[PDB]
């Protein structure tokens, strides 16, 4: 559903546990190539994998 | 070096152990989106992850 309007820029406002799962599922579906953008909306940017 | 001539189609002639490592490093560098091709050149196509 995020490919209906051809969305390129996503802000992830999740905690230290959900961000890793969302990044793992993005990597599984393959949406981390050059052309997109992500923001890890917390203070622990180095906490995730 | 495989992006010099803009290669799209890669045949992987490796055993059951090296194929998983190559697929993991492709997923790490992000070259498994729609547009590329792969051939797992062994009899154990369902053996890998
Ligand atoms: C950061 O993420 C965004 C979203 O994917 C992308 O931003 C684009 O980055 C390019 C650099 O590759 C920039 O283009 C520049 O545009 C300015 C306009 O003033 C121009 O003067 C420069 O010569 C250059 O062409 C731009 O900031 C930005 N937007 C567009 C439309 O290109 C990109 O993925 C990431 N950018 C960086 C720098 O990390
Ligand atoms: C992965 O994606 C699809 C599914 O296997 C493959 O797409 C098919 O590619 C062939 C070769 O380019 C297409 O044939 C072409 O048809 C056009 C239209 O007549 C013709 O002008 C070309 O000369 C060529 O014969 C075929 O149409 C296309 N299938 C569909 C449904 O569009 C693709 O090759 C696969 N492999 C990759 C990307 O390595």
Residues of chain B immediately before an interruption (C to N > 2.5 Å)? none
Q: Using CA coordinates, name the residue in chain A closest to B32.
A: A30
- Using a CB-CB cut-off of 8 Å, the residues of chain A touching B27 are 27, 30
Looking from the CA of residue B9, the nearest atom of ligand 2 is 39
Measured in angstroms, the CA of A34 and the nearest CA of chain B are apart by: 9
Residue ranges of E strands in B1-47:
9-12, 37-40
In degrees, to the nearest 5, what angle opens at C-alpha B18 toward C-alphas B49 and B43? Answer: 65
H/E segment holding residue A12: strand A9-12
- C-beta of residue A3 within 8 angstroms of C-beta of residue A28: no
Distance CA B18, CA B2 (A): 18
- Give the count of alpha carbons within 13 A of B16, CB side only: 6
> Resolution reached, in Å?
6.5
- C-beta of residue A35 within 8 angstroms of C-beta of residue A9: no
Task: Name the method of structure determination.
Answer: cryo-EM
Beta-strand relationship, A37-40 and A9-12? parallel
């Amino acid at each position: 559903d995020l490919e209906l309007k051809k969305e390129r820029r996503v802000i992830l406002d999740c905690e230290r546990d959900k961000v890793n799962d969302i990044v793992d599922q993005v990597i599984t579906i393959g949406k981390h190539v050059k052309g997109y953008h992500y923001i890890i909306a917390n203070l622990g940017f180095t906490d995730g994998d």
